Amino acid sequence: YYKGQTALHIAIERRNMALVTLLVENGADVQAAAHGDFFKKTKGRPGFYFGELPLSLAACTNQLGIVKFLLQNSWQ
Amino acid sequence: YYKGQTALHIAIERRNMALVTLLVENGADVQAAAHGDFFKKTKGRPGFYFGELPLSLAACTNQLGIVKFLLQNSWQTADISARDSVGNTVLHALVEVADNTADNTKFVTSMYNEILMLGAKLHPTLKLEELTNKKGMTPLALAAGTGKIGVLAYILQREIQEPECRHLSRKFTEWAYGPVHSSLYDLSCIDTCEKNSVLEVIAYSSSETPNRHDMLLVEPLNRLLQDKWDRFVKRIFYFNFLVYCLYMIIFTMAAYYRPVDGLPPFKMEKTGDYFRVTGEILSVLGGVYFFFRGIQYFLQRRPSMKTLFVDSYSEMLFFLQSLFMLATVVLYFSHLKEYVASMVFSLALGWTNMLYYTRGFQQMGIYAVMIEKMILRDLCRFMFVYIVFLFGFSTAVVTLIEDSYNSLYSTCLELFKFTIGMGDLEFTENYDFKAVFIILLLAYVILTYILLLNMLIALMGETVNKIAQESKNIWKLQRAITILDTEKSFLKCMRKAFRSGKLLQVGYTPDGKDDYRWCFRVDEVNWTTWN
Ligand SMILES: CCCCCCCC/C=C/CCCCCCCC(=O)O[C@@H](COC(=O)CCCCCCCCCCCCCCC)COP(=O)([O-])OCC[N+](C)(C)C
Ligand SMILES: CCCCCCCC/C=C/CCCCCCCC(=O)O[C@@H](COC(=O)CCCCCCCCCCCCCCC)COP(=O)([O-])OCC[N+](C)(C)C
Ligand SMILES: CCCCCCCC/C=C\CCCCCCCC(=O)O[C@@H](COC(=O)CCCCCCCCCCCCCCC)COP(=O)([O-])OCC[N+](C)(C)C
Ligand SMILES: CCCCCCCC/C=C\CCCCCCCC(=O)O[C@@H](COC(=O)CCCCCCCCCCCCCCC)COP(=O)([O-])OCC[N+](C)(C)C
Ligand SMILES: CCCCCCCC/C=C\CCCCCCCC(=O)O[C@@H](COC(=O)CCCCCCCCCCCCCCC)COP(=O)([O-])OCC[N+](C)(C)C
Ligand SMILES: CCCCCCCC/C=C\CCCCCCCC(=O)O[C@@H](COC(=O)CCCCCCCCCCCCCCC)COP(=O)([O-])OCC[N+](C)(C)C
Ligand SMILES: CCCCCCCC/C=C\CCCCCCCC(=O)O[C@@H](COC(=O)CCCCCCCCCCCCCCC)COP(=O)([O-])OCC[N+](C)(C)C
Ligand SMILES: CCCCCCCC/C=C\CCCCCCCC(=O)O[C@@H](COC(=O)CCCCCCCCCCCCCCC)COP(=O)([O-])OCC[N+](C)(C)C
Ligand SMILES: C[C@@H]1CC[C@@]2(OC1)O[C@H]1C[C@H]3[C@@H]4CC=C5C[C@@H](OCCC(CO)CO)CC[C@]5(C)[C@H]4CC[C@]3(C)[C@H]1[C@@H]2C
Ligand SMILES: COc1cccc(NC(=O)/C=C/c2ccc(Cl)cc2)c1
Numbered sequence: 035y036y037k038g039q040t041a042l043h044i045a046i047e048r049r050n051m052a053l054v055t056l057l058v059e060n061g062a063d064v065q066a067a068a069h070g071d072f073f074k075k076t077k078g079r080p081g082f083y084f085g086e087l088p089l090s091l092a093a094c095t096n097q098l099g100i101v102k103f104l105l106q107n108s109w110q
Numbered sequence: 111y112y113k114g115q116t117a118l119h120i121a122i123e124r125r126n127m128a129l130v131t132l133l134v135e136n137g138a139d140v141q142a143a144a145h146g147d148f149f150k151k152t153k154g155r156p157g158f159y160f161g162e163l164p165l166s167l168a169a170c171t172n173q174l175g176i177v178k179f180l181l182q183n184s185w186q187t188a189d190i191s192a193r194d195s196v197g198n199t200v201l202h203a204l205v206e207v208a209d210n211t212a213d214n215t216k217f218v219t220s221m222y223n224e225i226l227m228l229g230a231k232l233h234p235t236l237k238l239e240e241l242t243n244k245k246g247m248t249p250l251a252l253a254a255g256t257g258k259i260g261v262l263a264y265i266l267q268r269e270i271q272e273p274e275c276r277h278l279s280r281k282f283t284e285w286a287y288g289p290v291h292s293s294l295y296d297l298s299c300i301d302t303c304e305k306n307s308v309l310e311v312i313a314y315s316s317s318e319t320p321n322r323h324d325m326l327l328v329e330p331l332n333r334l335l336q337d338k339w340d341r342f343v344k345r346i347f348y349f350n351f352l353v354y355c356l357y358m359i360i361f362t363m364a365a366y367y368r369p370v371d372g373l374p375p376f377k378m379e380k381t382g383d384y385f386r387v388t389g390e391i392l393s394v395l396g397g398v399y400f401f402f403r404g405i406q407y408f409l410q411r412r413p414s415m416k417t418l419f420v421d422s423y424s425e426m427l428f429f430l431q432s433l434f435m436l437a438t439v440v441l442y443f444s445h446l447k448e449y450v451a452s453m454v455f456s457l458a459l460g461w462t463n464m465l466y467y468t469r470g471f472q473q474m475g476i477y478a479v480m481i482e483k484m485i486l487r488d489l490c491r492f493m494f495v496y497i498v499f500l501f502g503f504s505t506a507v508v509t510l511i512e513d514s515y516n517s518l519y520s521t522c523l524e525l526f527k528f529t530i531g532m533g534d535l536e537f538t539e540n541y542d543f544k545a546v547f548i549i550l551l552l553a554y555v556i557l558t559y560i561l562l563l564n565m566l567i568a569l570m571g572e573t574v575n576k577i578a579q580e581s582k583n584i585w586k587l588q589r590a591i592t593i594l595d596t597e598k599s600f601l602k603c604m605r606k607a608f609r610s611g612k613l614l615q616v617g618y619t620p621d622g623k624d625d626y627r628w629c630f631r632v633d634e635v636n637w638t639t640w641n
Contacts, residue, residue: 047287080290080633082287082289094288095288095289
């Protein structure tokens with residue numbers, strides 16, 4: 035249902051870049067596939083598809099500040 | 111006239127809180143009933159009803175500052191659940207003053223909100239919106255029963271964000287994920303109120319009540335009915351549609367294959383007679399059903415003599431269809447051949463009453479709504495004027511005839527043919543003055559065929575541009591009545607399978623118990639409520 039979710043995905047959706055930088059630096063992977071039922075195409079079901087990837091969420095969630103941070107962050 | 115008034119009532123209306131506090135502290139009662147003629151329902155008379163209580167006046171008069179003062183004033187505080195002779199509390203009375211203007215609607219909702227929290231802060235345990243007046247109506251039912259679209263649209267969508275005052279809120283958000291958020295409406299006393307559900311008050315109401323057809327567009331009502339439709343009513347309606355089509359197929363054949371040799375009641379001789387009388391039995395049974403099913407309607411929906419054609423045009427025809435069936439049985443055992451006359455009007459009504467079942471289908475049901483409007487609006491105006499002309503020029507014509515069309519029927523019958531494209535300008539030579547006969551028919555033709563029929567086309571087009579939305583909303587109300595008449599009749603014992611929504615714990619009783627509420631989920635998206 036939430037199969038594949040991470041606490042990094044939480045922070046992007048809860049308007050929390052202070053903790054996205056916290057999780058990535060401690061080694062939170064930024065390739066994680068939220069390949070869970072809630073995260074697929076809605077097709078009537080109460081869901082939100084964004085791309086099954088952390089960067090994809092931030093782009094579909096309107097924090098361009100976060101988005102750029104994911105790509106020049108030094109840890110990964 | 112002013113019977114029951116106090117100088118405290120004066121001060122609230124004369125914009126004087128400095129003296130309201132003056133009068134209460136000296137002991138001016140704040141329960142006083144202005145039970146005087148000027149203070150009752152207007153009903154044409156030059157009055158102002160506010161609730162027959164001081165607190166009620168301040169709420170209907172827009173001094174929230176005064177209103178709060180009445181309830182924490184130390185000398186004496188108004189009883190929040192205090193009602194009037196009508197039984198209307200402040201919230202009841204605060205509905206009856208609504209008039210569905212934005213400046214009024216913005217206020218009444220702004221005020222209605224605030225007495226609730228205040229009553230919750232004073233009394234977290236008392237339930238205000240559940241209180242019922244003398245008649246048996248709540249502030250919610252009163253808003254729907256009286257046409258109050260903005261109040262109703264407020265009460266249903268009531269999301270409050272406060273620590274102690276969410277148990278009053280009705281539109282709950284259960285979860286949220288980015289732009290997606292999934293709301294929850296309550297359904298308490300909306301679908302299954304023991305007394306006067308909102309649906310059963312919008313739909314079993316009178317067209318005098320404004321905005322019947324707009325109230326069901328308030329969320330969650332629209333989504334709620336389409337949920338009953340998709341779940342269980344659509345199948346039953348299509349089934350009801352099938353049985354009626356089999357009924358009319360059967361009443362059609364039993365009519366077509368009627369005996370022609372003898373007088374009724376006829377004899378079972380061959381086998382086809384047995385298999386026909388069956389259809390004749392089954393024909394009558396439907397008439398009895400539609401008879402009782404119509405008596406039922408016209409009792410529990412005591413019809414306003416004008417409202418018959420507007421709200422109940424189809425019910426009138428099914429009932430009328432029934433009457434011709436019953437007259438067809440009275441006359442079949444009374445040996446009279448005139449059963450056929452009755453019987454053929456039943457068929458013609460019977461098949462036209464298929465258009466009833468268009469209301470399970472949007473674009474067909476809207477079309478049948480437009481049909482019944484054109485009949486009552488455009489065609490009745492037309493046919494009136496048409497018959498004045500028809501009868502005017504016929505009499506003229508038949509007065510000129512000498513001799514055979516020397517009859518007002520045949521002349522009226524010949525002049526009606528012009529309007530169905532079958533007019534002979536030479537249907538008589540039997541007269542003395544051809545100039546008169548021709549000038550007069552041409553005047554008839556020009557006035558009726560060239561002008562008035564084509565004017566009707568033009569009138570209809572004006573109507574279609576107007577009733578287009580009205581007819582969509584009358585359609586949804588027709589379907590609503592089907593959903594309600596269905597879920598009553600079908601279950602009528604168990605009333606457990608149509609339960610729209612589910613037990614969803616939304617919060618807590620302000621004492622601390624759990625807040626379980628039958629609630630209707632709605633999924634929604636935003637792209638500007640980014641927080
Ligand atoms: C279709 C869907 C609806 C339901 C099914 C109905 C099935 C339809 C059939 C049903 C029965 C057919 C009879 C067969 C045997 C006799 C044949 C015969 O002589 O026929 C003749 C008359 O026939 C009749 O008059 C028959 C009566 C038909 C009424 C319709 C059925 C009523 C429903 C209850 C029946 C059971 C159904 C109950 C279950 C639903 C044929 O006409 P003819 O020879 O020219 O006669 C003179 C004609 N004239 C009078 C016009 C001048
Ligand atoms: C069943 C018994 C009779 C046979 C059926 C005959 C009627 C047809 C079946 C009717 C019931 C079952 C159909 C369900 C499937 C969809 C149909 C369809 O194409 O809808 C489409 C067209 O709209 C129509 O086809 C509706 C037209 C018929 C309405 C009844 C009017 C009078 C019937 C007199 C008949 C003579 C009876 C005498 C001889 C039998 C779409 O409809 P819509 O306008 O966009 O509305 C929204 C659609 N929705 C609600 C599905 C979301
Ligand atoms: C785009 C919109 C669509 C519009 C067009 C759609 C199509 C429509 C248009 C055209 C197609 C129609 C085809 C029919 C042709 C006429 C009939 C004929 O020729 O003879 C037949 C007439 O006799 C009977 O039918 C028997 C009488 C008893 C039964 C009557 C009920 C009929 C069946 C149930 C009806 C219920 C409905 C169906 C079920 C629910 C057979 O007679 P025969 O063999 O020559 O001789 C037998 C003796 N007799 C004649 C003395 C009796
Ligand atoms: C072998 C013998 C049987 C042969 C086949 C029998 C089948 C014959 C076929 C057709 C006629 C069927 C009986 C008469 C009904 C008339 C149609 C009607 O009212 O439909 C209703 C459908 O809703 C219903 O509830 C219909 C009844 C359901 C039962 C199915 C038919 C069998 C009952 C009969 C017993 C059979 C035993 C013998 C009886 C002598 C109409 O819907 P409504 O919601 O009321 O809305 C319209 C009116 N309103 C808007 C004003 C409200
Ligand atoms: C006999 C000689 C008379 C001529 C022939 C009689 C045959 C019948 C013909 C015409 C007769 C005159 C009627 C026309 C009245 C105007 C239409 C009207 O107000 O419709 C209203 C609805 O409709 C209804 O509320 C009911 C309509 C049916 C009842 C009238 C006809 C039959 C009864 C009467 C007695 C006669 C019956 C037979 C004998 C007893 C509203 O329509 P509108 O206002 O246009 O809508 C625009 C809305 N707007 C206002 C918001 C903009
Ligand atoms: C919808 C159609 C048009 C109107 C119908 C309603 C009108 C009713 C019509 C006729 C009268 C009612 C019947 C009474 C008894 C029989 C008398 C009779 O028919 O006529 C008598 C004459 O009479 C006339 O020539 C004048 C009668 C009409 C004027 C009355 C006002 C009608 C008002 C409403 C009008 C609509 C107002 C406009 C709309 C607001 C006798 O004529 P006869 O018997 O034919 O004589 C044949 C002689 N032969 C045996 C040698 C062959
Ligand atoms: C909107 C309000 C309008 C008011 C309505 C008032 C209605 C008044 C209208 C008309 C009344 C006047 C004419 C008829 C007089 C009575 C009969 C008569 O004397 O006939 C004479 C014949 O006469 C002819 O043969 C010549 C025809 C002349 C008239 C034609 C134009 C008038 C209509 C213009 C239309 C535009 C109207 C205005 C709009 C632009 C003599 O009798 P006869 O025996 O017939 O003679 C032999 C002839 N035959 C062998 C052929 C038989
Ligand atoms: C808004 C209020 C409503 C309207 C109220 C007024 C409406 C009044 C309408 C029309 C009145 C005018 C038409 C004539 C009427 C009959 C008079 C007559 O006696 O004619 C004679 C024709 O005599 C001729 O000389 C022929 C010329 C007329 C052409 C026919 C009209 C065509 C129909 C459309 C005209 C539309 C014009 C109307 C425009 C308004 C007929 O007798 P006859 O014995 O056949 O005579 C000659 C025969 N011969 C040649 C074989 C020898
Ligand atoms: C609700 C609907 C309103 C319209 C309507 O359906 C119901 O109302 C019905 C009443 C019927 C009449 C009743 C009585 C008679 C008397 C009879 O006289 C010979 C009697 C003979 C044996 O007694 C000699 O004594 C002639 C026929 C007539 C006038 C009927 C005609 C059809 C009528 C008008 C029917 C019509 C279709
Ligand atoms: C929702 O049902 C609808 C909607 C619109 C129109 C109608 N039917 C009529 O007006 C039928 C009229 C009529 C008149 C005379 C005779 Cl003899 C038979 C029938 C039904």
